[PDB]
């Protein structure tokens, strides 16, 4: 009963932390109703607020303990750290606020909560830190108490209670006020009394050149200092800062202010000191996606009311081009590393035109470019546009490779969407021609590729880098002479190492090289070679990269006698898929091993084996273990109630992998009782169970299946529904 409660609560917290639902004001209500939902019988106990906060404290600490103490059994390079940073952010940011506006400011309850923990967590944390590395080794408990001090929750005499008996902390040194302090140009800590005004004032005077070249922290801009010093922000103030961006960003879309839109996207993309992760950890990524995709979709109507007959048009067109081009880079970074799908948001919001959405089909075909150039895709049945489609290709090739200048007429007559596909087409044709031997002059091309770096033509580089590895992978296996190979690097180095960069293109060029760097580095090392890796490692070191082996980035001289793994999930012959899933069967059945409570290592494992084979190889294999060994935890093989709770562990886990939000549960109950519902959950178990339920019922009318077999299958189905309806999601 207690074990059931703790398992259910740990999996519930893990799922809710993954699902970005911390910002939901229903967190405490669901956490309180967990106890009543788990026990079918009525449990009418008045749980006081201190009890709720204490339960949250030990639940979070034990969950983090298991999360960090299950990592040694993983592969040493099966690196997934998004959830680790997510735990850190939650425990250091939200729980202090949960106490702040949920607690009664009782110092005793905090002492009881942090004194009731086992020493196993402390021993494991210290052992792991020592193995990774006396040097200052602070734990997550110190950061928890420090945040409470800034909120006036506890006096400065409380931190000394939990400190080691030999080392104290000076009370005066610890910050005690929640006011923003920034180092000015003269070194005086200035008080930022107003947050929104500070952002807009700095944003207006912000320079796009100061993004990556300003390695030093002594920058005159206060806002840029905050990004590199993001780890020390006050607990309550960062919520205001995150909310400040949202209100400012939504207003910029309404007013069509192109200057501030492009600058904002540059800060968020690079993710200095884990800046972008905290943003999703406060606003829901769905709402952020909706406004962001509205701009990229509704921008079509904005080009029919502007006439290029003013000297500010070239300023505006560059401002328009960069505002649109940067907004694309924000989506790709979110989709690739942060695990968000563009298709899902369109289904949830009916106001998005799926069939007429250019963004949706662009991302899914990002690494692949069409061999033919089409001005419009929905009207391929017409030939009038195809006549001038070839005209555009020859017009751009002659002007950029022979004339050496870009006429203003070409830019005005073409849209950004055609440019996003025109640039990959031309570079592919030139690069392919060079490789075969059609093009033999390099020097004219080196200057030619310089024109792709202008602010007007910046959006055309997004698809250029993705195609490179597919181009390079064939090159790696194919036999290419060094004379051609050194030429390929010469043409490539022009895009990689420009001689000069404009004040609006230097940060953009680094940003695009950061999206698809990792697979490029692996292919390049398989072979003027060093500068490309030197440039690639330089752009990889500007900010941390998630789920990457740090040995790969700095493998210049380190030789640990262990082969590097470039992927999130890695498998060897010594530890094949059999051993891990046999250890999963030992955990799916007897809850052995230590790979559980790790949805990083499990969700990817499910996909690698597919939900069908994952469920098929465990459901029917359970009987063999059950028929011989028996139900663990009971010394008597009497009754099926003991085995009933064991089945609840397996079915409750599958529910969370299917249901992700609150209102979604109320609609899946109607799916079972019988269009838009199953669209979002193509790979869910619920679809697989329901599609077989209706199909075998059809055979029941025709009588090709025994009645006993049909009764067995519905037993699994009704159990899934029964827990779905009795538990609130």
């Amino acid at each position: 009963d207690m074990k059931l409660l703790r398992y259910y609560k740990n999996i519930w917290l893990n799922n809710k932390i993954i699902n970005w639902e911390i910002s939901n004001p229903d967190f405490l209500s669901k956490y309180s109703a967990i106890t009543s939902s788990i026990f079918q019988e009525s449990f009418n106990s008045v749980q006081n607020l201190d009890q709720l906060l204490t339960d949250l404290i030990e639940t979070s600490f034990t969950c983090f303990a298991q999360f960090v103490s299950n990592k040694q059994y993983h592969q040493a390079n099966s690196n997934l750290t998004l959830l680790e940073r997510k735990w850190v952010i939650f425990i250091t940011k939200h729980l202090p606020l949960l106490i702040l506006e949920n607690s009664s400011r009782s110092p005793r309850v905090v002492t009881n909560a942090l004194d009731n923990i086992d020493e196993k967590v402390v021993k494991a944390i210290r052992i792991y830190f020592t193995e990774k590395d006396p040097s200052t080794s602070l734990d997550i408990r110190h950061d928890f108490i420090k945040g409470l001090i800034m909120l006036n929750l506890q006096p400065a005499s409380v931190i000394n209670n939990y400190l080691r008996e030999d080392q104290m902390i000076d009370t005066s040194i610890l910050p005690t006020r929640d006011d923003l302090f920034v180092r000015n140009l003269q070194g005086i800590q200035e008080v930022v009394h107003n947050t929104n005004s500070f952002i807009i004032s700095s944003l207006d005077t912000l320079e796009l050149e100061s993004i990556t070249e300003s390695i030093t922290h002594d920058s005159s801009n206060g806002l840029f200092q905050v990004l590199h010093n993001f780890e020390s922000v006050a607990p309550t103030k960062q919520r205001e800062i995150v909310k400040a961006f949202l209100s400012i960003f939504e207003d910029a879309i309404k007013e069509l202010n192109y200057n501030r839109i492009a600058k904002i996207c540059a800060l968020l993309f690079f993710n200095f000191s884990h800046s972008l992760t905290t943003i999703l950890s406060f606003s829901s990524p769905a709402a952020l996606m909706k406004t962001l995709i509205k701009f990229v979709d509704l921008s079509r109507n904005g080009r029919n009311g502007s006439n290029g007959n003013d000297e500010s048009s070239e300023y505006e067109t560059i401002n328009i081009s960069l505002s649109f081009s940067w907004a694309i880079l924000l989506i790709i970074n979110l989709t690739q590393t942060y695990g968000i799908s563009v298709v899902d948001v369109a289904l949830k919001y009916p106001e998005l035109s799926i069939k007429n959405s250019f963004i949706i089909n662009f991302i899914s075909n990002l690494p692949n470019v069409s061999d033919k150039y089409y001005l419009e895709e929905s009207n391929v049945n017409d030939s009038d546009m195809l006549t001038k489609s070839h005209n555009t290709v020859q017009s751009w090739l002659c002007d950029l490779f022979v004339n050496g200048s870009i006429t203003d007429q070409l830019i005005q007559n073409i849209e950004t969407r055609q440019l996003a596909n025109l640039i990959p087409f031309i570079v592919k044709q030139v690069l392919l021609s060079v490789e075969i031997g059609v093009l033999t002059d390099i020097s004219s091309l080196i200057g030619g590729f310089e024109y792709f770096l202008q602010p007007l033509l910046l959006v055309g580089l997004i698809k250029t880098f993705y195609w490179l590895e597919q181009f390079l992978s064939c090159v790696k296996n194919d036999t290419i002479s060094e004379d051609i190979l050194q030429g390929i690097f010469n043409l490539l180095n022009t895009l990689f190492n420009p001689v000069t960069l404009n004040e609006d293109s230097k940060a953009f060029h680094t940003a695009v090289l950061r999206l698809n760097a990792i697979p490029l580095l692996k292919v390049l090392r398989k072979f003027n070679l060093e500068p490309l890796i030197a440039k690639l490692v330089a752009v990889l070191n500007v900010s941390p990269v998630y789920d990457v082996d740090p040995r790969i980035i700095n493998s210049e001289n380190d030789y640990s006698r262990k082969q590097l793994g470039y992927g999130k999930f890695l498998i060897l012959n010594e530890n094949p898929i059999n051993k891990i899933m046999t250890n999963q069967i030992n955990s799916f059945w007897s809850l052995h091993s230590s790979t559980y409570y790790n949805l990083d290592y499990l969700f990817e494992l499910i996909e690698l084996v597919t939900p069908k084979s994952f469920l098929f190889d465990v459901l029917k294999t359970l009987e063999y273990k059950l028929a011989t060994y028996g139900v663990p935890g009971s010394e008597n093989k009497r009754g099926s109630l003991d085995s009933e709770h064991v089945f609840d562990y397996f079915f409750y886990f599958l529910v969370l992998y299917d249901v992700k939000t609150a209102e979604e549960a109320s609609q899946l109950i109607e799916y079972m009782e019988n269009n838009k519902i199953s669209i979002l959950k193509r790979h869910s178990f619920a679809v697989l169970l329901h599609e077989r339920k209706l199909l075998n019922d059809l055979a029941l009318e025709n009588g090709e299946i025994t009645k006993t077999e049909n009764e067995k299958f519905i037993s699994y189905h009704d159990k899934y529904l029964c827990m779905l309806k009795t538990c609130v999601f």
Partner: protein
């Protein structure tokens, strides 16, 4: 869940080897079709066997896939089965270490775990003693789990037919056969055989055996030839379909790795002879691999409905078709909608002034649960949920069962028919896939095999036609079934499935009008001769070729089964006597050639009489002639039956039940065939008289008895010899009197004389 696409395999010789998952003592089963009482059919008794990795000297594992070597022009007897653990067990049938055996007895070649040679003849489980073997379930998908198995053909060429058209000028159907040169990868003659298997981890295997040795060799590689073993053991391929391409020694390993969520393409190259300058030094083939292309799948349709990849089946396309690029049929299902979309892609090189070009999209109204590609037929089968099957042709993706309705009749070639399915013979209400363990359309598409959970025996469903009351469609149907066998013989298929389907339609015809059904047989078998460019109205030179032809062993067998229900009818009797005369032909002339060579061996081997080899040679000379005596008794007993009917028919010429006597004499080659038998009989007796046995008088009994049985026959052979000779001359002058080609068919098959030639019947 996906069905068992490779759980069962119909061997080209009729053996149905399928996986067994219910018996606790066996994992494989063998059976075949047999006739109950000449009319009905039943499957043979299941011959259960047990396969475990430790047959070389104990728990056995489940069977993953069964692949008969029926690909291309291979003999189709060497069965190699791969278990769930990844061990490839090769079983040879029809051969024993010491002698030759029938097709229902198995034998091992080698076992893989390292590979070793151990020849051992397997025995059935039921006959074997109770052994200590339990069904251990390998519920783990190992790195060595073979995804797709493919066989390698030899350098032999295969000749098949593509289609037939109705020649309205002659009001007859015409077919053209085109030779198919080998395409893809083929193993040289000096290698006994070769095979390829792709494992789920990406590791590849290449088993081969040298024709001059018994030891087996294995060469293994991995697809992802990276410098790190971290990614070597990561390629968990969901689908790995190997389609040979027209490129020399190349196989397109179309794989879909969910790790990178892209349909990656590969190319595999093999050099059979590394050192062509040293033919004597047989070097191991070298294996090479080269990455080519990778693409991402489309998320949505045109109208805004998302898609999910259900299956990735690429068709094995030869160079015959207009665009030889293989069709990558990525199936998608629109969720909560009965529609199912099948997007088609083709791989083509990138041209200057590779890539995947999208041709079109095809929408199907029902969800698909299984896809099986037909062999040597170019037919993709869509096993929908409701049991209906819609086979789309590879050429145009036009439905075969509805092609006639939508065919543009006007043109030079009309009524293009490729299979009996084009006529309209649609399968009935098949059992629902949830209850079905596995399905497989029969090779001729005439019926479907269904294995049921509660049925201990395989079922069978045939094709039915709703408009059986319309008499005008008999002309098309007979021609459609005529071409069904034409493809089967060229592919050396038994085509027992097609025989059952033809009889059921004939039976329904005979229930209403018995007269109509008889004409259906005559028209049906006539089209076979036209399709194969063999003419029973040709001059006598071609007639000798007909007797030695294999098809008469099968085309005559057709009426042996299609005419069984007709009691007291001579349609089957006429075919059997000619067929048995062929067996009678193999008796005398089969040994007349053998006996002739024994004459020369006597003279040249007369210089060593005391050697221990001549004594056995001498004994065998006079023993062989003894075994012919029982055959000669039936030979005399046969000619008396026809002579007896002569006396009976004279008194009552109006008896229709004794019309078989007319056809026997009417057959043109039979009169010559018996004359040839009488000729060699005279030659044998003359040779025996010229060269009698003198060393041992006791051995002369067999030679003397041969002379006695001929002289003591109740009817003199010389008088009977002139009987058939005179019939031939009279039946030739009648052809010049009036030209007719149906009389040749009538005297050979119908065993009757047309009413327009009633005067000819009185002469006999």
């Amino acid at each position: 869940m996906m069905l068992g696409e490779h759980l069962m395999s119909w061997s080209k010789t009729g053996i149905i080897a399928y996986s067994d998952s219910q018996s606790s003592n066996a994992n494989i089963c063998l059976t075949f079709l047999e006739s109950i009482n000449g009319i009905n059919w039943r499957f043979h008794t299941p011959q259960k066997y047990v396969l475990h990795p430790q047959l070389h000297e104990q728990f056995f594992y489940n069977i993953s896939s069964i692949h008969w070597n029926n690909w291309f022009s291979l003999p189709g007897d060497m069965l190699a089965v791969c278990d769930e653990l990844g061990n490839m067990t090769m079983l040879i049938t029809g051969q024993r270490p010491d002698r030759a055996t029938t097709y229902e007895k198995l034998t091992m070649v080698f076992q893989d775990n390292k590979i070793y040679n151990h020849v051992m003849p397997l025995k059935p489980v039921d006959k074997l003693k109770p052994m200590n073997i339990e069904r251990k379930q390998t519920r783990k998908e190992y790195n060595t789990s073979i995804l797709e198995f493919r066989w390698l053909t030899s350098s032999k060429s295969v000749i098949v037919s593509q289609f037939c058209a109705f020649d309205s000028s002659s009001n007859t159907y015409r077919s053209r056969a085109q030779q198919v040169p080998p395409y893809g990868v083929y193993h040289p003659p000096f290698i006994k055989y070769a095979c390829l298997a792709i494992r789920k981890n990406g590791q590849i295997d290449f088993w081969y055996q040298f024709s001059n040795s018994k030891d087996h060799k294995k060469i293994t590689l991995q697809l992802l030839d990276t410098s790190n073993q971290r990614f070597k053991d990561l390629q968990w391929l969901e689908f790995a379909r190997i389609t040979p391409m027209n490129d020399d020694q190349c196989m397109l390993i179309t794989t879909y790795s969910k790790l990178s969520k892209n349909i990656s393409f590969y190319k595999l190259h093999v050099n059979w002879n590394l050192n062509a300058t040293k033919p004597n030094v047989l070097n191991d083939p070298s294996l090479k691999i080269q990455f080519i292309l990778s693409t991402t799948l489309d998320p949505t349709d045109d109208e805004g409905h998302v898609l999910k990849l259900e299956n990735l089946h690429v068709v094995s396309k030869s160079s015959i078709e207009k665009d030889p690029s293989p069709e990558i049929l990525v199936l998608y299902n629109v969720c909560d909608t009965s529609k199912s979309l099948v997007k088609r892609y083709r791989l083509a090189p990138t041209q200057l002034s590779y890539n995947l070009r999208r041709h079109s999209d095809i929408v199907l109204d029902k969800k698909v649960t299984l896809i099986t590609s037909e062999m040597f037929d170019a037919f993709v089968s869509f096993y929908f949920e409701d049991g209906t099957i819609e086979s789309y042709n590879q050429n145009d993706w036009k439905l075969e069962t509805e092609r006639l309705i939508s065919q543009s009749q006007l043109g030079k070639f009309k009524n293009i028919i490729a299979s009996p399915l084009s006529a309209g013979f649609n399968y009935g209400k098949l059992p629902l896939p949830p209850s079905v363990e596995w399905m497989k359309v029969s090779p001729s598409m005439c019926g479907v095999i269904v294995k049921q959970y509660n049925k201990k025996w395989p079922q069978f469903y045939a094709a039915v036609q709703k408009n059986y009351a319309d008499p005008e469609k008999d002309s098309i149907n007979a021609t459609a079934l005529a071409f069904g066998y034409v493809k089967s013989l060229h592919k050396q298929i038994s085509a027992e499935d097609l025989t059952i389907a033809a009889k059921t339609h004939i039976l329904r015809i005979s229930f209403l009008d018995r007269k109509r059904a008889k004409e259906f047989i005559t028209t049906l078998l006539k089209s076979l001769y036209s399709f194969f460019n063999i003419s029973p109205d040709a001059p006598k030179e071609i007639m000798d070729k007909i007797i030695t032809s294999r098809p008469l062993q099968k085309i005559m067998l057709l009426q042996l089964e299609l005419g069984s229900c007709f009691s007291q009818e001579n349609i089957e009797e006429m075919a059997r006597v000619i067929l048995y005369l062929k067996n009678v032909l193999f008796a005398f002339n089969g040994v007349a050639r053998n006996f002739h060579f024994a004459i020369e061996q006597i003279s040249n081997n007369s210089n060593q009489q005391q050697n221990p080899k001549l004594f056995q040679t001498i004994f065998s000379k006079q023993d062989l002639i003894h075994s012919l005596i029982p055959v000669a008794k039936w030979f005399v007993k046969f000619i008396t039956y026809l002579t007896q009917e002569i006396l009976i028919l004279i008194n009552d010429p109006t008896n229709k039940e004794y019309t078989l006597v007319h056809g026997i004499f009417g057959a043109k080659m039979s009169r010559t065939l018996i004359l040839s038998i009488l000729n060699e009989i005279k030659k044998v007796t003359q040779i025996v008289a010229k060269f009698p046995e003198t060393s041992y008088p006791i051995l002369n009994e067999s030679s003397t008895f041969l002379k006695l049985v001929l002289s003591e026959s109740p009817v003199d052979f010389e008088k009977f010899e002139t009987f058939l000779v005179d019939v031939n001359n009279k039946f030739i002058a009648l052809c010049e009197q009036q030209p007719s080609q149906e009389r040749e068919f009538s005297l050979l098959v119908k065993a009757e004389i047309p009413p327009e030639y009633a005067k000819v019947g009185d002469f006999l």
